[model samples]
Target: ESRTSAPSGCLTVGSDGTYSTIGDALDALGSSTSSACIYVASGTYEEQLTIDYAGNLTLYGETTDTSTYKDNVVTITHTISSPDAGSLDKSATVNVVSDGFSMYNINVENGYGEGAQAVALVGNADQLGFYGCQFSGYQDTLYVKAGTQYYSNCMIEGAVDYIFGDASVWFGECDIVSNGAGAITASSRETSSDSGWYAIDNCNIKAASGVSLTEEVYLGRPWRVLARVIYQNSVLSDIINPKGWTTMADGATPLYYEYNNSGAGSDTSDREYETSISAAVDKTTVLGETWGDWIDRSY
Candidate 1:
């Protein structure tokens, strides 16, 4: 039943302990093969996984189910910091630049306590899909990228611009947790750029009770002065400070908007306005024409 190899699909860190490590299995992957499946068993994998050529690759974990998958999931961590550490080290965990890459039911973490600039998963890959995954960390938990990417039923927990970057992304039914006081998005999609949009649809933005997570969570800040973001049909808890959004770094002009959002902090009565796209904005324009192949419009 193996599609492209002797084993069909291969095993990593096998339950039988026959293989010394997963790296050996990955090294054994045939170069002639364009696709391969890897199934990781239950346990903690503390090694770094570099997907230099993971095109159209599907990775399934034995613990993919919710009951045990989240508990017995894949973990990636790094302590390397700026200057000495390159972009790969800053984007420490799961630095993927491949295409058509999909990961499900896995937990990728940086585990950098507080005030950490490290990232959990710096997904720079285009056409990437992360489903039912858990990204936990302090700062920059999950960088949802600079290309067309999608996330569903995912948990992203962090503080200060944890989910920041210049990327066109969509989050559906996802849980956004704020661990401290700071903006949620630090996007570089300046108003000048024609591409770059962070869309959050049908997601829940919440924090712990009595935590007073106000004025900290912004719709986004212009990482470049033209950063654009919109939250439609999403839930915003009172944990979102009354200010709704804030400006920083010399006040970059960004296009921020909220459509049909519910919850206590949904009102935009007193939010700052650089430029509102009340007219001439198309719904389907965000994904562009090539997105029909991979984007799931069901949400």
Candidate 2:
């Protein structure tokens, strides 16, 4: 059901609710495994939120459209960096450590611009899904910690190793924007047996507006020895360097590949350390065959 106001059983956060912050609403559902949800109003929430419950929970924001992040009006923001902070998870605006979680039509950001590793969203659980969402930061924006996750029709903006993780993530029909000259991903699949993959399909990769990163960006780099990633059926702009993949640690044997990608930077002539795939890798290869049972495929 569509709602401009909070629906029953849903903890509402805004001017019309008893709770003033989203973290407070989450606190009300402390440690409960039962299914619950939260509905946030249209405003910029200047606070950090961490979900540590095991219930099948979802977060919905007031939006005119729920299919894309272009019109999202609710933004959860914070300013914490890893240099001044303790660790990466501590520097996140939204540190989600719960499984079976879904977020829709909201923007999560780290206001700590440039320099240090400031995370926007930290997904540290299984069966997580983010639809029509916006994740913005500079360095280390979206941290896919573990488990099976899905991001659809979302906009992820960052500069450095923003999209880093060891999760089996599938990105579909999303916008991957580079705010400055830096690598897009830093996959941390240490071994070939690890169930970590960053398979980006049907997405658009480009430089952010007015960000002149011509021939200064890379598709990804190996965060671990056996880092695995693939970009298929995506539109890569000229902002990407001709050598698509760069290096991270020494002796890093990464499995980076691309298939049927088209754009000015899609040429694999001078590409190094990345492989070429003959056929597109199926969703089942990355997200498993039973992905439809968990993911919301409507988007």
Candidate 3:
């Protein structure tokens, strides 16, 4: 930790009183060499806040209703048009790099509207957990960047790689919303022969419009050369395209699979060149040794 005018206890965020900015509160936490709980007082905080490799921090909101947390939403963005920005890393409105970080009952959004590539909740931290939260954006909404993470009872809405990254993550009992057409994954795993699969379990993967979707939308595409993903015991609807999955660019050597998923879109009769792993990839195998304990088996 580092020290400016440190507060007596944990920080509070509101429109009228106390710390004026979330960054201010976080800076105080950085300066004080102490970890604190930031209680956001349920107003639309229209600014990008980053955890800056700070760990053991918890962020909470005043309420989960639209009147407060939903107006503008607690947004975090770190958009780097060039992934190889080198020193110039993209901005993450909220960047979680430290382990044991937790966020609860808040909405993290990227009010970038559409066509813009701003990142909303980017987590490159291991042992991360999120509860009763909402992540909304157009593209790259909830980026689970390079780390092992776990998210339960969360709602993530986006069109493109809304729920993406190279982390071995498990999203359970969550609402995965597809606002439009585009594959869900863009995973860039480091190892060429690793089993860094995108395991989406016990989820509701559907379209947001509620209207009839007369086209194709895939659960995921190959993010890496040997990318792996499995959707087991999940619910889908007609909103999910019948074709099931798609590829990014050309010559994609992605290993995409679906195991016992139920819905109109779950039919694998006409899947375009997707591998069937249910017969070979056992559930215990998908839940690797390093990250298996974090996932729930109630599915």
Candidate 4:
């Protein structure tokens, strides 16, 4: 369905909308105590966005179809690297620090191609949800810093340590694209009791079109003492390195697992530091029992 029109009470952005830019609309709607939303028109916005509202906030990007990022017409882009910004979180193109925040059909891209850590999106608040959105960068693209987050039908593109974080993230039916050779994920969960995991279910991992990867792209590596990651019912393309995973910290025993993954890179014969799982990780285990209360099932 076409999502060009803004919702009844949503603030509008872009030429066709009320505001010329997304930041202006956000400024006008500042830290609302009540639920607020913004609808962005079809255009490329060259700006960094940070949502730190105190109440529930929703951002919608205009698209012909609301169920996928392939038809998204709104892109928020920035060109800042980690070294220049002095930190990983500070270099993010979009930052979400609002509880119960949700976004749909928006494309966030960090234009720094390589040579430094560039992040596209950072989520650090509870109940942060993303649906049919897209994030692209060369390194450390999507940072699930903290909280309980849910992503469905989204597209994430990156190179090294792309999806690194400590949040409990449940990614479903999303596309994980590697633009170059490197480890895809680097989870930093330190203890077994920590409620943080890189749970990817029913997703697809492959190389970007027109670009060939050859430096051995690994599924993941540990960034802490007890990193945990799992891939279930996902297609691992042949571009994945045969070793599957690598090491980061000294003597770090990563809790990596794979189940029912089929493709050229699915064989566990030469896999290292990864366990062959007997059962698939369930949705409730990653997202809590009351996940339906926060998740946007419409995607």
Candidate 5:
């Protein structure tokens, strides 16, 4: 069931589609009670998208391979950054405000480069899942703002605080790329018992091309008092700062944990404010037991 073209029963966007643009296709779904989906053709869509659909929705990008982002041809691009847009949500290229939503093989990017905050994908609801997608930006790239989400086989590249959020999320086998010297995550989980965490399991963390960073990047920094993040069984390259994590929130009791990670940056001798854990955090802990019901495990 590879999504190389538009799936049956989906509203098409792009050449040969009924609607010429993705927004027009989304507007075509106005006030419908049925579960809907939008299939984007292989093209660079230069428009910002906001998905506030009521029912369950799924988005599929035309790709030669659905299991990986290597062949992704559909891109949603926007150039608005935080300052001009007035807020973070307003500057997002693809903002999802609906529950029960999933995306496959889509490339979302905020072309606003370094010096300002620009969001590529914002998951502002629950039961969200993304597979084989690519999110790239200079800073504040993938905002898992809230809700329970699952991301597998995706490439997220950013410079500063790229993966910041309070969402109870699971990142399985995704690529965390650093575009520059900066912390990767800025988790905002405010309480120890909060249901939010950035669980990066079985992923790879490295610097982007032409970026010569040696132990200048941190795993994460606390954006809130009790920020929680974990990277278990992942490959941490030399780009990872030896301090492991930096500080932001004052008097923050952040639970920054790393387990079984290999590579030059995996040494914990110079790490600061790292908590010890016997076992790695699992997908079930972050996404819950019924996580399989919402996430697309096909990839």
Candidate 6:
């Protein structure tokens, strides 16, 4: 159903309505403290969307199920090069700078393949959650720039520095797919006092179809001095290199660790620069002391 004929309280966006685009719906929202929601129909929306609202908001897509990205039918795609746009954030297909934002069953993509840096989702918000969503790009796909974020049952595909961010984000049961020979993350947590960590829990790491990346991909590298990241209880495929982490231009010392992980890529015999540990990191360590207050633990 179109936005006009749908429901009254909840907003709708599709091709056959006054709010034909996602941007139009967001523009109409303006600013509000009340909770809001937008239901998008099944279609490929080719537009750059920016949500900088104040209130709590959730975007739901037409999907067979709300728990997985596999059933998502709405796709938002754009093709803007970072070099052409003068900044990486400017090239994102979906730039979310809001607080208390949630997205379910949607696909966000940047069609600028195999070239300069382009982003699919630039999440610069706090208390953000992504469920059953898909983020695809060649490089810098999902930038969890700042905030406390959660990604569950989602698919994040990329190559070099794809999941780069400073947020204390958690990825649970998500698919981390590599499209080429590159690092998975380049986190920039510059100081010991910085509350930034990227923890991949119960996730899978492997190469995309038709992409041969065996032993060609590093788990991550430092984007800043004190960059921190961890992968625990996850399946790491052979796409990961033995030396799980690489060096950056500044030669910053990063805190990279793995625990209770299984797969050919989880071999720690020759692992260099990354910490090998026996203790597993709890949710409170990564997501903050009061994580249970904001995070949905049921997932």
Clashing pairs in 5: none
lDDT (CA) for every model shown? 0.66, 0.90, 0.65, 0.90, 0.90, 0.87
Prediction-by-prediction clash tally: 10, 0, 12, 0, 0, 0
lDDT string, candidate 4, 148-215, tens digits:
89989999999899998898898899999999889999888888789777799999998999888853
Error of 5 at 184 (Å): 0.3
Q: Least accurate stretch of 10 residues (summed lDDT) in model 5? A: 1-10
- For model 4, the superposed segments whose C-alpha errors exceed 4 Å read none
C-alpha positional error of residue 11 in candidate 4 after TM-score superposition, expressed in Å? 0.6
Candidate 1, 1-299: lDDT as tens digits: 11221134555545454354445556666453477656655555665566556446655544535322244355545554333356634546667676777765677777556754767787777777777677777776777667778887788888777777776777777888887777787777755646767788888898844566765676656556777778778899876766667776576777788887899778878777435655433334565667767654433
Which RMSD values do the candidates have, in order? 4.2, 1.4, 5.8, 1.2, 1.1, 2.6
lDDT by residue for model 5 (115-215), tens: 89999999999899999999999889999999999999999999899999899888999999998989999989997568777899999999898989898
lDDT score of residue 172 within candidate 6? 94
Q: Which candidate do you rate higher for lDDT, 1 or 3?
A: 1
Cα-based lDDT at residue 266, candidate 1: 82
Best by lDDT: 5
Candidate 2 residue lDDT tens string, 131-198: 99999999999998788899999999999998998989999999999998899999888976786679
Model 5 / residue 66 / CA error / Å: 0.6
TM-score of each: 0.84, 0.97, 0.80, 0.97, 0.98, 0.94
Q: List the residue pairs that clash in candidate 2.
A: none
Please, what's the RMSD in Å of model 5?
A: 1.1
| Model 4 TM-score, 2 decimals | 0.97
